[PDB]
Design a protein around this ligand. Sequence first.
Ligand SMILES: O=C(O)c1cc(Br)ccc1NS(=O)(=O)c1ccc2c(c1)CCCC2
Length: 88
Amino acid sequence: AMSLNIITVTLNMEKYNFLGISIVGQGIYIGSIMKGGAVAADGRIEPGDMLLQVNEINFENMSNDDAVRVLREIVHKPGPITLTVAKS
Ligand SMILES: O=C(O)c1cc(Br)ccc1NS(=O)(=O)c1ccc2c(c1)CCCC2
């Protein structure tokens, strides 16, 4: 029962305006993590992690443009953000 290295992270976003991440690729990967963001504060998500799902949206075959657009609309809405990432 070796780990599949799939981790799910729920951020409450009460104290943070933004995830504070950049993304690369077209899978979609965490390119970098910004200081002062909810992701940096939580600390679980790292650069090179592959983005599988954020809230109700799957990211597995999505353009970089479409990924940036969807993430803004998700971060714009108030309430928790759940990210599912592949660490392998
Ligand atoms: O929240 C992010 O880090 C983010 C990442 C990508 Br990739 C695309 C969009 C993102 N969110 S965002 O709504 O554009 C955003 C980015 C920065 C900030 C905000 C929103 C809110 C004010 C503080 C600075």
